[PDB]
């Protein structure tokens, strides 16, 4: 007779509890690194939020690809446990060495003089791409912070959570991991703010952000060591399933042949279309919103404190949306649920763009509501991003990992692997390539606002007319089998 606590088997609590706590610690570091990497590249002197479009395509896109080939080559010469110590520990070493060594010694290694010479000979519209060379070590931090969410979150954990949880355990407790992932946004958001508030202790030239940064990178090491400690616990005290070698000798189906499969199957092309549209449009709004953020919070510490507040608000909103997701679904349907994220993104983004653009002959509201137009833009963009992401993880991702079900477990297993590592970087990089062309054609990101709103309609229109193309293929396969 197996014992039970809280209506759940004790034997499966030793697996799920350290797994959700480890997912908590992973999203705790992620919520700290993702706020920090925006502080570094945007609030750096000589750098603005226009470095983001060029970081996504020219810097971290080749590094993310180059990381996926190093990981793929290491996935054959290392064991499963050795793989989750060679890909997780250099991250902990890097961020610990950054806040304590690399960042302090950054006015020693950043070519501020050469970047200024390049800035004059090229023009004012090149501050974006040139800042990549100006603060290159901050750009390397940006890549590693991106690679945390791309590898530690998406690859390392879910690759380990899927190899140890039963198919029915992965169906009941995975919705609870996302719930606990946003508790790691409320807390780490409060953590980021607490360590971002400038200590009343002033310095002659003491960087208030240097002491603030290493107070965060210490927790990243501290929580990163908990991930390695929890992972070691679950791999020695938890009896894992004995699923044999028989998983179709997993042939990760290259890249070119991968999107060849994409176009071949009409069911996967639309899903990839949704996954890239969310990733183009979110960037199209978010980079301009971060430009406004830089305008409102020039200091690194004020920007970081706002990032912590924003992370806490995002966590609360996403927790509420995950709670009401399995009422929206059950009431309205997959087709309705797949439309809100495009719709919320479109509406919030166009409201934010029409407050930036048509903010001139509309300002009694922002005036009597106790704000400046810049602060109003900051708050509207923050609400845009909060609603878009709380819809993402509560309606879009549920729709994505619900549309896989009616597919055959060969097409499903290959297509699901093809979606993540391709479409997520592909969407996040195309949405930035668009903005690179915008910046280098119209000069600044603010001169690109009328068009950034118009590509937003085009991407969302193809995003809306791809779920309907899938609401009718999801319904077809899920009804005929009945």
């Amino acid at each position, epitope marked *: 007779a197996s014992p039970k606590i809280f209506g759940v088997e004790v034997a499966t609590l030793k697996k799920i509890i350290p797994l959700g706590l480890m997912f908590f610690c992973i999203l705790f570091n992620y919520t700290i690194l993702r706020d920090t990497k925006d502080v570094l590249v945007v609030t750096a002197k*000589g*750098s*603005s939020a226009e470095i983001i479009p060029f970081l996504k395509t020219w810097v971290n896109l080749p590094m993310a690809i180059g990381f996926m080939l190093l990981y793929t080559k290491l996935s054959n010469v290392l064991s499963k446990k050795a793989l989750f110590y060679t890909v997780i520990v250099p991250f902990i070493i890097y961020f610990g060495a950054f806040g304590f060594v690399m960042y302090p010694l950054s006015n020693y290694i950043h070519p501020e003089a050469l970047a200024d010479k390049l800035l004059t000979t*090229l*023009g*004012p519209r090149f*501050m974006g791409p040139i800042a990549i060379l100006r603060i290159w070590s901050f750009c390397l931090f940006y890549v590693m912070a991106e690679l945390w969410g791309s590898v530690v979150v998406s690859v390392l954990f879910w690759g380990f959570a899927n190899q140890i949880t039963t198919v029915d355990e992965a169906k009941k407790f995975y919705p609870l991991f996302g719930l606990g992932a946003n508790v790691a946004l409320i807390f780490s958001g409060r953590t980021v703010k607490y360590f971002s508030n400038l200590r009343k202790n002033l310095g002659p030239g003491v960087d208030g952000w240097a002491v603030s940064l290493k107070a965060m990178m210490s927790i990243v090491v501290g929580m990163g060591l908990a991930i390695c400690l929890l992972y070691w616990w679950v791999n020695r005290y938890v009896p894992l399933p004995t699923r044999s070698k028989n998983k179709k000798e997993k042939p990760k189906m290259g890249t070119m042949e991968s999107l060849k499969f994409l176009v071949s199957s009409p069911y996967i092309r639309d899903l990839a279309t949704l996954v890239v549209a969310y990733g183009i449009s979110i960037n199209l709004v978010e980079v301009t919103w971060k430009s406004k953020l*830089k305008a409102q919070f020039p200091s690194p510490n004020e920007y970081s404190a706002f990032m912590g507040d924003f992370s806490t608000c995002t966590g609360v909103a996403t927790f509420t949306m995950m709670l009401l997701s399995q009422y929206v679904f059950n009431k309205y349907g997959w087709g309705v649920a797949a439309k809100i994220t495009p719709t919320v993104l479109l509406l919030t983004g166009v409201a934010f763009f029409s407050l930036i653009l048509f903010g001139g002959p509309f300002a009694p509201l922002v005036a009597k509501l106790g704000m400046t137009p810049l602060l109003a833009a900051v708050y509207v963009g923050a609400l845009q991003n909060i609603f878009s992401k709380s819809a993402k993880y509560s309606l879009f991702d549920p729709c994505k990992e619900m549309a896989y079900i009616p597919l055959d477990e060969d097409t499903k297993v290959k297509g699901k692997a093809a979606i993540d590592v391709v479409c997520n970087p592909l969407g996040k990089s195309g949405g930035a390539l668009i903005q690179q062309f915008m910046i280098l054609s119209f*000069g600044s990101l*603010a001169n690109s606002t009328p068009y950034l709103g118009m590509i937003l309609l085009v991407i969302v229109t193809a995003w809306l007319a791809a779920a309907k193309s899938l609401e009718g293929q999801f319904n077809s396969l899920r009804s005929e089998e009945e």
Partner: nanobody
Amino acid sequence: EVQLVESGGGLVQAGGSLRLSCAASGFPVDEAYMTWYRQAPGKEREWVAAIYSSGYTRYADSVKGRFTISRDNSKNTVYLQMNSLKPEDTAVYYCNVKDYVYNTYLYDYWGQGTQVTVSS
């Protein structure tokens, strides 16, 4: 139409301070790349300081630490805070807004300049 009007110039003693204003009309100063020049008689026009739309500031080696360029977004005015003024700083200071890609100058608007003379 773009218009740059400088003010705040005058006669000050060596080691004094002076603040030049540049009331911009026809474009927002926050999205512009604005620069300060100076030209003494006999010598060619010399670039002094430059501010970017990002708020990034550059200064010539002759005025680093002493001069500070800044803009007020409400009044649409850039400022040149000249501190520890030397007699070598005596020149006509020009407010300039321009945009260019390499050697193609898309626009280049100058002000009429203000006379800054430092006595001794």
